[PDB]
Amino acid sequence: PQREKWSSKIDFVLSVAGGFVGLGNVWRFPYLCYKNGGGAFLIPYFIFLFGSGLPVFFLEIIIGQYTSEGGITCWEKICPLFSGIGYASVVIVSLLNVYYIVILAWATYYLFQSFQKELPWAHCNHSWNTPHCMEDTMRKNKSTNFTSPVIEFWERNVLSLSPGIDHPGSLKWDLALCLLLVWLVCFFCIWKGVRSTGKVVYFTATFPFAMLLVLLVRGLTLPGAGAGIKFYLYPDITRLEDPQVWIDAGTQIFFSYAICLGAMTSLGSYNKYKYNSYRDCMLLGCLNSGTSFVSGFAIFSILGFMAQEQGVDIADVAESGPGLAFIAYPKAVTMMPLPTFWSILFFIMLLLLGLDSQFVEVEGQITSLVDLYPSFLRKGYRREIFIAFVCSISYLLGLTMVTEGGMYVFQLFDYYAASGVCLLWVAFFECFVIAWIYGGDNLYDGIEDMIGYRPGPWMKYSWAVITPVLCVGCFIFSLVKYVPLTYNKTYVYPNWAIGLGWSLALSSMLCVPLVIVIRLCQTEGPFLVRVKYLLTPREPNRWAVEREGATP
Ligand SMILES: *[C@@H]1O[C@H](CO)[C@@H](O)[C@H](O)[C@H]1NC(C)=O
Ligand SMILES: CCCCCCCCCCCCCC
Ligand SMILES: CCCCCCCCCCCC
Ligand SMILES: CCCCCCCCCCCC
Ligand SMILES: CCCCCCCCCCCC
Ligand SMILES: CCCCCCCCCC
Ligand SMILES: CCCCCCCCCC
Ligand SMILES: CCCCCCCCC
Ligand SMILES: CCCCCCCC
Ligand SMILES: CCCCCCCC
Ligand SMILES: CCCCCCCC
Ligand SMILES: CCCCCCCC
Ligand SMILES: CCCCCCC
Ligand SMILES: CCCCCCC
Ligand SMILES: CCCCCC
Ligand SMILES: [Cl-]
Ligand code: NA
Ligand code: NA
């Protein structure tokens, strides 16, 4: 048959908007900004945004629309050599789906804990509370060893943090059921009803932004919001000399935009050929980066309020790692009237934000993997078993991040697996193939035919110059000034853990060289002839079904 198009352009926007607006905006951005100083994170953030985030996102969407193919076969059409970009993106999205559902497991645990008379993270007189704990309101009335009740709940009850990754501990069975529950929700929403949220499109889309608005109003009116905002906005120039703020800000844009994963290319292949996706991507790009910037005001206002309440520095009031959104927002919902009611909504809001993202990504890899075996899969019961097998195996590897030492494994996955140099590796090669091998101007001819007009030179120069320079420059300077990964500024990772972390990165990075070697070996002839034949596009726009032109 053929790849079914979208019912209407409104479905493309909502599927895309729900695919990369979520935990990457409200969870990962606040703590990466928090970890890398304050506002010094924003300069590389906006530089990378306007240089390579929107351009690469639009490039992925337009490649999918031009080839009408998934993550992998689109690159086979565009350039048979360097086809390893698709396999690299599939590996990256597999690892991402592995560790990205643990966040939803934690959110589900918090939501289940929210159903009681008093929030468990309001006061600290429970079993898990260390005698070092003290009420935040009593912190000033009452050195550097008085933990807040909110941080204890995260490290003592929700995570049961162990001494280190070398100390796995026991599998938190309460979190293991929550991790299983969200996977069953993902499994039941992937097999039956791939896109079945059509009845509640209005509620499931406007509510997460409606809930984020209340958090912003509550945070901004807090007494300490002034100091938190100045920390969030005003930059520190000396921090820009560190290569880590550029890697974090550069790959946060790539993470938040879901690029180098094959999801955007697949989502871009479901719309009509003669559809102006250039305008809609720019609007969706504003909605994505706008949500991260605006929601950053809310979380950093609470951080400023917490610092004033506890009489501590803003940079030391919460966790410099994952769980900042689980320390700040659960503190904000305490301050609201009827804290239990608002706590339920936030973790429901946090869960729909991530479930929609997980649906797009998990369906993204499964569709991409089916394209490799179109007859073996997507045919009868064979898709039943394969979907469950992917969900089951990716759930078992998610169990290693649920044990008491599972937080340290989560930091390794979040820093190496689907972020960091692995994303810079794929993003550079996506732009290098299009801009220099395929041709930047050679693709504008396709885009002009496809969207109706020739775009400006912003996209062309971003692929040709800015993105390779930003990706290579951040890659070279990161290895030159090597700083090993740390958890919460204190824990130092053992050598094997870093080596394990690089294996997660290098497993997808080496997909590009391996396929080049595989393709060169398969093709017969002189080496220069072998390279020449594998670089020629094989009719990317092979879809007469629609009024189209030709690749040349
Ligand atoms: C907290 O640290 C202070 C200063 O070192 C020390 O005097 C006090 O005994 C500590 N209290 C607890 C509960 O550990
Ligand atoms: C009246 C209640 C709302 C108060 C909002 C406070 C906003 C503070 C703005 C500080 C900006 C600093 C930029 C460097
Ligand atoms: C803010 C840093 C990145 C901005 C990239 C804009 C590039 C515009 C195209 C230049 C044409 C000469
Ligand atoms: C997990 C290790 C990498 C798996 C993917 C390797 C790519 C092989 C492509 C073979 C077909 C050309
Ligand atoms: C700066 C890097 C330039 C790379 C040039 C590659 C040229 C390949 C041409 C293939 C045409 C089908
Ligand atoms: C390695 C992380 C889990 C990957 C499971 C799905 C991809 C492989 C299917 C055979
Ligand atoms: C900087 C982000 C917007 C770029 C649009 C203008 C491109 C410059 C040449 C007209
Ligand atoms: C529903 C929005 C919450 C805003 C809280 C304002 C507190 C004023 C006392
Ligand atoms: C054919 C590519 C399979 C990739 C699965 C992901 C393993 C890390
Ligand atoms: C809370 C979501 C705000 C979105 C703003 C979009 C325009 C910058
Ligand atoms: C690695 C220690 C925890 C084991 C949980 C299950 C892993 C397959
Ligand atoms: C793979 C580069 C860093 C590895 C550090 C630990 C090696 C055992
Ligand atoms: C990850 C959960 C998958 C369950 C499949 C049951 C057939
Ligand atoms: C992060 C991209 C590095 C490219 C190196 C090419 C040899
Ligand atoms: C000064 C803070 C305003 C925030 C608007 C989103
Ligand atoms: Cl973002
Ligand atoms: Na979403
Ligand atoms: Na995002």
XYZ file of N, CA and C in Angstrom, residues 42-259:
654
model
N 21.216 30.529 29.309
C 20.307 31.027 28.283
C 21.031 31.492 27.026
N 22.244 32.034 27.153
C 22.969 32.496 25.967
C 23.278 31.351 25.010
N 23.931 30.258 25.425
C 24.038 29.110 24.517
C 22.691 28.530 24.150
N 21.701 28.611 25.043
C 20.378 28.083 24.726
C 19.785 28.784 23.514
N 19.747 30.117 23.533
C 19.151 30.843 22.417
C 20.043 30.821 21.185
N 21.367 30.819 21.370
C 22.265 30.698 20.226
C 22.017 29.383 19.501
N 22.001 28.275 20.246
C 21.733 26.976 19.647
C 20.328 26.909 19.081
N 19.355 27.513 19.761
C 17.991 27.517 19.259
C 17.967 28.127 17.868
N 18.262 29.421 17.769
C 18.138 30.110 16.493
C 19.204 29.708 15.483
N 20.212 28.935 15.877
C 21.181 28.478 14.907
C 20.937 27.081 14.379
N 20.561 26.144 15.250
C 20.455 24.751 14.858
C 19.242 24.017 15.413
N 18.403 24.634 16.240
C 17.279 23.897 16.776
C 16.092 23.949 15.847
N 15.633 25.160 15.547
C 14.620 25.323 14.510
C 15.093 24.851 13.139
N 16.309 25.165 12.674
C 16.720 24.659 11.353
C 16.744 23.144 11.247
N 17.299 22.440 12.235
C 17.355 20.983 12.151
C 15.964 20.380 12.306
N 15.128 20.971 13.160
C 13.756 20.492 13.311
C 12.988 20.619 12.001
N 13.080 21.783 11.357
C 12.433 21.957 10.064
C 13.048 21.056 9.005
N 14.359 20.821 9.069
C 14.996 19.917 8.120
C 14.457 18.504 8.264
N 14.290 18.036 9.500
C 13.731 16.706 9.720
C 12.305 16.621 9.199
N 11.483 17.621 9.526
C 10.094 17.609 9.072
C 10.031 17.618 7.552
N 10.863 18.441 6.914
C 10.808 18.582 5.467
C 11.392 17.355 4.775
N 12.372 16.687 5.387
C 12.878 15.435 4.837
C 11.794 14.368 4.879
N 11.099 14.266 6.013
C 10.000 13.321 6.103
C 8.905 13.608 5.094
N 8.584 14.888 4.898
C 7.538 15.246 3.947
C 7.976 15.012 2.506
N 9.256 15.237 2.203
C 9.760 15.048 0.850
C 9.822 13.572 0.485
N 10.366 12.747 1.380
C 10.534 11.331 1.078
C 9.305 10.500 1.413
N 8.417 11.006 2.269
C 7.261 10.247 2.750
C 7.699 8.912 3.342
N 8.801 8.938 4.087
C 9.379 7.738 4.668
C 9.701 7.982 6.134
N 9.900 6.888 6.862
C 10.152 6.958 8.285
C 11.529 7.471 8.642
N 12.016 7.094 9.824
C 13.308 7.585 10.270
C 14.469 7.043 9.458
N 14.407 5.770 9.077
C 15.554 5.101 8.469
C 15.517 5.185 6.951
N 14.394 4.813 6.334
C 14.345 4.741 4.878
C 14.427 6.111 4.218
N 14.063 7.178 4.933
C 14.225 8.517 4.380
C 15.686 8.804 4.078
N 16.585 8.392 4.973
C 18.008 8.579 4.726
C 18.511 7.661 3.625
N 17.911 6.479 3.479
C 18.253 5.618 2.353
C 17.906 6.294 1.033
N 16.784 7.013 0.993
C 16.432 7.744 -0.220
C 17.332 8.960 -0.420
N 17.590 9.718 0.647
C 18.356 10.957 0.523
C 19.805 10.659 0.154
N 20.431 9.732 0.868
C 21.822 9.368 0.631
C 22.053 7.935 1.092
N 22.206 6.980 0.172
C 22.415 5.587 0.602
C 23.615 5.407 1.512
N 24.725 6.081 1.229
C 25.806 6.175 2.196
C 25.417 7.192 3.259
N 26.000 7.051 4.448
C 25.564 7.788 5.634
C 24.134 7.439 6.021
N 23.649 6.273 5.594
C 22.344 5.797 6.029
C 22.344 5.377 7.489
N 23.513 5.321 8.123
C 23.599 4.999 9.530
C 23.007 6.044 10.444
N 22.651 7.213 9.915
C 21.993 8.225 10.732
C 20.646 7.715 11.229
N 19.913 7.000 10.374
C 18.644 6.434 10.802
C 18.800 5.413 11.912
N 19.772 4.509 11.774
C 20.009 3.514 12.816
C 20.488 4.168 14.106
N 21.329 5.196 13.993
C 21.759 5.932 15.174
C 20.574 6.564 15.881
N 19.668 7.180 15.121
C 18.492 7.797 15.725
C 17.583 6.754 16.361
N 17.464 5.575 15.747
C 16.649 4.517 16.342
C 17.255 4.035 17.657
N 18.577 3.873 17.707
C 19.216 3.486 18.964
C 19.021 4.568 20.020
N 19.177 5.835 19.624
C 19.003 6.940 20.562
C 17.583 6.958 21.109
N 16.586 6.780 20.241
C 15.203 6.817 20.705
C 14.871 5.586 21.536
N 15.514 4.446 21.273
C 15.305 3.279 22.125
C 15.807 3.544 23.537
N 17.027 4.069 23.657
C 17.549 4.397 24.980
C 16.707 5.482 25.648
N 16.240 6.452 24.860
C 15.406 7.519 25.395
C 14.095 6.980 25.941
N 13.441 6.085 25.202
C 12.215 5.478 25.700
C 12.488 4.611 26.915
N 13.699 4.066 27.015
C 14.059 3.283 28.190
C 14.101 4.162 29.437
N 14.787 5.312 29.373
C 14.933 6.052 30.628
C 13.870 7.125 30.820
N 13.083 7.444 29.792
C 12.142 8.551 29.855
C 10.838 8.167 30.533
N 10.579 6.869 30.692
C 9.384 6.403 31.382
C 9.603 6.297 32.884
N 10.852 6.351 33.347
C 11.102 6.402 34.782
C 10.603 7.716 35.363
N 10.664 8.797 34.587
C 10.121 10.070 35.049
C 8.623 9.946 35.272
N 7.928 9.290 34.343
C 6.501 9.059 34.509
C 6.220 8.102 35.658
N 7.127 7.161 35.923
C 6.981 6.313 37.103
C 7.042 7.135 38.383
N 8.000 8.058 38.469
C 8.083 8.934 39.636
C 6.853 9.825 39.749
N 6.383 10.357 38.619
C 5.189 11.196 38.635
C 3.968 10.407 39.086
N 3.839 9.161 38.629
C 2.740 8.312 39.073
C 2.831 8.028 40.563
N 4.041 7.779 41.067
C 4.204 7.561 42.500
C 3.783 8.792 43.292
N 4.197 9.976 42.841
C 3.807 11.206 43.523
C 2.300 11.412 43.466
N 1.687 11.128 42.315
C 0.242 11.281 42.178
C -0.504 10.332 43.106
N -0.034 9.088 43.216
C -0.653 8.144 44.140
C -0.483 8.600 45.581
N 0.687 9.150 45.917
C 0.898 9.679 47.259
C 0.078 10.935 47.525
N -0.395 11.611 46.477
C -1.167 12.834 46.650
C -2.576 12.587 47.170
N -3.046 11.341 47.175
C -4.420 11.037 47.575
C -4.474 10.726 49.071
N -4.332 11.781 49.869
C -4.490 11.671 51.313
C -4.798 13.050 51.878
N -5.120 13.076 53.173
C -5.543 14.320 53.811
C -4.437 15.366 53.789
N -3.204 14.958 54.072
C -2.058 15.852 54.070
C -1.003 15.324 53.110
N -0.391 16.232 52.364
C 0.665 15.845 51.440
C 1.859 15.309 52.220
N 2.429 14.170 51.822
C 3.540 13.595 52.596
C 4.794 14.449 52.602
N 4.938 15.387 51.667
C 6.115 16.239 51.595
C 5.868 17.628 52.169
N 4.803 17.796 52.952
C 4.548 19.079 53.597
C 5.355 19.215 54.883
N 5.135 18.310 55.831
C 5.864 18.274 57.087
C 6.707 17.010 57.152
N 7.764 17.055 57.958
C 8.655 15.908 58.107
C 8.600 15.405 59.547
N 7.650 14.503 59.799
C 7.606 13.716 61.025
C 7.315 12.252 60.715
N 7.561 11.829 59.478
C 7.272 10.476 59.037
C 8.468 9.564 59.300
N 8.313 8.287 58.947
C 9.361 7.308 59.219
C 10.625 7.604 58.423
N 10.477 8.025 57.168
C 11.623 8.237 56.296
C 12.397 9.512 56.605
N 11.882 10.382 57.467
C 12.517 11.670 57.710
C 13.695 11.508 58.661
N 14.873 11.924 58.208
C 16.056 11.937 59.051
C 15.902 12.996 60.143
N 16.422 12.737 61.347
C 16.368 13.763 62.403
C 17.005 15.087 62.015
N 17.799 15.126 60.944
C 18.346 16.385 60.457
C 17.290 17.296 59.847
N 16.100 16.781 59.547
C 15.101 17.581 58.857
C 14.570 18.698 59.750
N 14.096 19.757 59.099
C 13.506 20.899 59.778
C 12.504 21.547 58.837
N 11.419 22.062 59.410
C 10.413 22.745 58.610
C 11.005 23.992 57.967
N 10.583 24.268 56.732
C 11.099 25.434 56.020
C 10.733 26.728 56.734
N 9.499 26.825 57.233
C 9.098 28.014 57.975
C 9.909 28.173 59.254
N 10.404 27.070 59.809
C 11.204 27.096 61.025
C 12.701 27.145 60.753
N 13.119 27.158 59.485
C 14.545 27.150 59.174
C 15.227 28.422 59.664
N 14.603 29.575 59.424
C 15.192 30.838 59.855
C 15.019 31.053 61.352
N 13.875 30.639 61.903
C 13.661 30.750 63.342
C 14.664 29.897 64.110
N 14.928 28.681 63.627
C 15.896 27.820 64.296
C 17.319 28.330 64.116
N 25.633 23.275 61.360
C 25.309 24.214 60.297
C 25.365 23.519 58.944
N 24.546 24.012 58.012
C 24.454 23.474 56.653
C 24.123 21.985 56.652
N 23.318 21.544 57.623
C 22.925 20.142 57.694
C 21.458 19.973 58.075
N 20.613 20.961 57.789
C 19.177 20.869 58.039
C 18.473 20.713 56.698
N 18.124 19.478 56.358
C 17.441 19.195 55.107
C 15.965 19.564 55.195
N 15.407 19.970 54.060
C 13.996 20.311 53.992
C 13.149 19.050 53.844
N 11.893 19.086 54.301
C 11.032 17.901 54.151
C 10.807 17.485 52.709
N 10.767 18.438 51.777
C 10.513 18.102 50.378
C 11.659 17.277 49.811
N 12.894 17.653 50.138
C 14.071 16.946 49.551
C 14.161 15.543 50.158
N 13.842 15.401 51.445
C 13.854 14.067 52.094
C 12.879 13.146 51.360
N 11.655 13.601 51.090
C 10.646 12.721 50.449
C 11.215 12.185 49.134
N 11.885 13.042 48.365
C 12.470 12.632 47.065
C 13.611 11.640 47.266
N 14.533 11.920 48.186
C 15.739 11.062 48.323
C 15.520 9.917 49.314
N 14.507 9.995 50.172
C 14.334 8.948 51.211
C 13.153 8.040 50.862
N 12.033 8.608 50.414
C 10.825 7.786 50.150
C 10.727 7.459 48.658
N 10.728 8.468 47.788
C 10.512 8.196 46.336
C 11.717 7.466 45.738
N 12.946 7.868 46.072
C 14.135 7.270 45.404
C 14.872 6.305 46.334
N 14.792 6.501 47.650
C 15.597 5.661 48.575
C 17.041 5.696 48.073
N 17.559 6.892 47.780
C 18.912 7.026 47.173
C 19.934 6.155 47.908
N 20.718 5.374 47.156
C 21.767 4.509 47.751
C 23.077 5.298 47.838
N 24.159 4.760 48.442
C 25.448 5.458 48.468
C 25.983 5.803 47.069
N 25.807 4.908 46.092
C 26.346 5.147 44.739
C 25.820 4.154 43.719
N 26.198 4.320 42.448
C 25.767 3.378 41.372
C 26.369 2.003 41.670
N 27.530 1.971 42.331
C 28.197 0.690 42.685
C 27.397 -0.011 43.786
N 26.405 0.671 44.362
C 25.528 0.046 45.390
C 24.091 0.047 44.859
N 23.697 -0.936 44.021
C 22.366 -0.939 43.409
C 21.238 -0.981 44.448
N 21.409 -1.768 45.511
C 20.358 -1.897 46.537
C 19.244 -2.818 46.077
N 18.043 -2.657 46.636
C 16.909 -3.551 46.289
C 15.931 -2.821 45.365
N 15.250 -3.562 44.488
C 14.308 -2.936 43.527
C 13.107 -2.387 44.301
N 12.939 -1.062 44.317
C 11.761 -0.457 44.988
C 10.500 -1.027 44.337
N 9.836 -1.974 45.004
C 8.663 -2.615 44.422
C 7.529 -1.626 44.195
N 7.407 -0.608 45.049
C 6.358 0.386 44.856
C 6.578 1.184 43.576
N 7.831 1.521 43.272
C 8.137 2.196 42.016
C 8.128 1.238 40.833
N 8.400 -0.048 41.068
C 8.386 -1.021 39.981
C 6.978 -1.226 39.439
N 5.972 -1.203 40.314
C 4.591 -1.293 39.849
C 4.182 -0.037 39.096
N 4.619 1.132 39.569
C 4.326 2.373 38.860
C 4.975 2.386 37.484
N 6.211 1.892 37.385
C 6.864 1.792 36.085
C 6.135 0.809 35.180
N 5.646 -0.295 35.746
C 4.859 -1.240 34.963
C 3.532 -0.630 34.535
N 2.910 0.159 35.412
C 1.591 0.708 35.116
C 1.632 1.666 33.933
N 2.639 2.541 33.882
C 2.723 3.486 32.773
C 3.096 2.775 31.479
N 3.892 1.707 31.560
C 4.201 0.939 30.358
C 2.964 0.234 29.821
N 2.118 -0.289 30.711
C 0.864 -0.889 30.269
C -0.038 0.149 29.620
N -0.051 1.369 30.158
C -0.791 2.451 29.520
C -0.207 2.754 28.148
N 1.123 2.804 28.049
C 1.757 3.004 26.750
C 1.493 1.830 25.819
N 1.571 0.602 26.338
C 1.326 -0.564 25.497
C -0.111 -0.595 24.995
N -1.071 -0.263 25.856
C -2.468 -0.269 25.442
C -2.820 0.903 24.540
N -2.063 1.997 24.588
C -2.303 3.134 23.714
C -1.488 3.082 22.429
N -0.614 2.094 22.276
C 0.193 1.938 21.072
C -0.375 0.861 20.160
N -0.714 -0.301 20.721
C -1.361 -1.341 19.927
C -2.715 -0.881 19.404
N -3.665 -0.651 20.303
C -5.017 -0.261 19.931
C -5.176 1.241 20.109
N -5.620 1.915 19.054
C -5.759 3.355 19.097
C -4.426 4.070 19.114
N -3.700 4.008 17.994
C -2.398 4.666 17.904
C -2.539 6.160 18.173
N -3.534 6.791 17.551
C -3.899 8.181 17.824
C -5.402 8.187 18.088
N -5.782 7.930 19.339
C -7.182 7.810 19.724
C -7.636 8.927 20.656
N -6.791 9.924 20.900
C -7.139 11.041 21.769
C -7.962 12.110 21.058
N -8.566 11.784 19.913
C -9.316 12.763 19.146
C -10.534 13.313 19.859
N -11.106 12.550 20.792
C -12.300 13.012 21.492
C -11.978 14.138 22.467
N -10.779 14.125 23.046
C -10.425 15.063 24.105
C -9.217 15.899 23.704
N -9.093 16.204 22.409
C -7.966 17.005 21.940
C -7.946 18.366 22.624
N -9.121 18.966 22.828
C -9.176 20.275 23.471
C -8.702 20.204 24.917
N -9.155 19.196 25.665
C -8.788 19.107 27.074
C -7.335 18.682 27.246
N -6.904 17.653 26.514
C -5.571 17.104 26.729
C -4.461 18.038 26.267
N -4.782 19.083 25.508
C -3.786 20.032 25.030
C -3.801 21.350 25.791
N -4.981 21.919 26.038
C -5.055 23.204 26.721
C -4.822 23.081 28.221
N -5.209 21.958 28.828
C -5.042 21.811 30.273
C -3.587 21.879 30.721
N -2.631 21.180 30.093
C -1.242 21.302 30.564
C -0.728 22.728 30.543
N -1.139 23.525 29.559
C -0.785 24.938 29.561
C -1.630 25.732 30.545
N -2.878 25.320 30.768
C -3.690 25.960 31.796
C -3.112 25.716 33.184
N -2.642 24.494 33.447
C -2.048 24.198 34.746
C -0.712 24.908 34.919
N 0.074 25.010 33.844
C 1.335 25.738 33.921
C 1.108 27.218 34.189
N -0.025 27.758 33.741
C -0.338 29.155 34.017
C -0.552 29.393 35.506
N -1.270 28.490 36.176
C -1.527 28.650 37.606
C -0.227 28.574 38.392
N 0.650 27.636 38.029
C 1.952 27.541 38.680
C 2.754 28.821 38.489
N 2.643 29.441 37.313
C 3.342 30.697 37.067
C 2.785 31.821 37.930
N 1.458 31.913 38.041
C 0.853 32.950 38.871
C 1.192 32.730 40.338
N 1.126 31.481 40.802
C 1.469 31.197 42.191
C 2.938 31.486 42.467
N 3.823 31.083 41.556
C 5.244 31.307 41.770
C 5.624 32.775 41.750
N 5.063 33.537 40.809
C 5.444 34.938 40.665
C 5.017 35.774 41.863
N 3.918 35.413 42.519
C 3.431 36.178 43.660
C 4.102 35.788 44.968
N 5.010 34.819 44.950
C 5.713 34.437 46.161
C 6.682 35.542 46.579
N 6.951 35.677 47.880
C 7.817 36.777 48.336
C 9.221 36.739 47.759
N 9.780 35.557 47.523
C 11.138 35.426 47.044
C 11.301 35.335 45.543
N 10.265 35.657 44.765
C 10.352 35.504 43.318
C 11.358 36.464 42.697
N 11.626 37.595 43.352
C 12.534 38.572 42.775
C 13.957 38.062 42.656
N 14.463 37.416 43.708
C 15.819 36.884 43.663
C 15.924 35.690 42.727
N 14.877 34.869 42.651
C 14.911 33.724 41.758
C 14.924 34.122 40.295
N 14.187 35.178 39.946
C 14.137 35.621 38.557
C 15.475 36.215 38.131
N 16.103 37.004 39.005
C 17.408 37.571 38.681
C 18.447 36.477 38.485
N 18.367 35.411 39.282
C 19.235 34.256 39.073
C 18.957 33.597 37.729
N 17.682 33.502 37.352
C 17.312 32.827 36.113
C 17.675 33.657 34.887
N 17.564 34.982 34.981
C 17.724 35.839 33.811
C 19.146 36.375 33.668
N 19.643 37.070 34.684
C 20.937 37.730 34.582
C 22.049 36.699 34.428
N 22.857 36.775 33.378
C 23.855 35.735 33.127
C 25.140 35.974 33.907
N 25.960 34.927 33.954
C 27.298 34.973 34.533
C 28.285 34.677 33.412
N 29.059 35.689 33.019
C 29.910 35.566 31.837
C 30.988 34.510 32.050
N 31.516 34.413 33.272
C 32.598 33.469 33.533
C 32.155 32.027 33.322
N 30.871 31.733 33.534
C 30.374 30.378 33.324
C 30.367 29.988 31.853
N 30.341 30.962 30.941
C 30.352 30.661 29.515
C 31.672 30.069 29.045
N 32.734 30.171 29.843
C 34.012 29.581 29.472
C 34.030 28.070 29.653
N 33.140 27.531 30.477
C 33.033 26.092 30.664
C 32.397 25.447 29.434
N 32.975 24.359 28.924
C 32.346 23.664 27.793
C 31.048 22.969 28.155
N 30.776 22.757 29.444
C 29.605 21.981 29.834
C 28.308 22.747 29.620
N 28.319 24.066 29.822
C 27.098 24.839 29.624
C 26.700 24.848 28.155
N 27.673 24.763 27.246
C 27.354 24.726 25.823
C 26.846 23.354 25.393
N 27.404 22.278 25.951
C 26.882 20.942 25.675
C 25.471 20.798 26.227
N 25.255 21.252 27.463
C 23.944 21.115 28.085
C 22.897 21.942 27.355
N 23.213 23.203 27.054
C 22.253 24.058 26.362
C 22.078 23.638 24.913
N 23.156 23.196 24.268
C 23.046 22.762 22.887
C 22.204 21.514 22.729
N 22.423 20.523 23.586
C 21.694 19.268 23.504
C 20.363 19.298 24.239
N 20.096 20.332 25.038
C 18.750 20.509 25.569
C 17.800 20.970 24.475
N 18.285 21.811 23.564
C 17.483 22.207 22.412
C 17.171 20.993 21.548
N 18.180 20.157 21.296
C 17.974 18.971 20.472
C 17.080 17.961 21.177
N 17.204 17.850 22.501
C 16.326 16.965 23.258
C 14.897 17.486 23.262
N 14.722 18.772 23.569
C 13.385 19.340 23.680
C 12.655 19.338 22.345
N 13.382 19.447 21.240
C 12.771 19.439 19.919
C 12.649 18.040 19.334
N 13.062 17.013 20.075
C 12.886 15.614 19.685
C 13.549 15.300 18.350
N 14.589 16.042 18.002
C 15.299 15.816 16.754
C 16.424 14.820 16.998
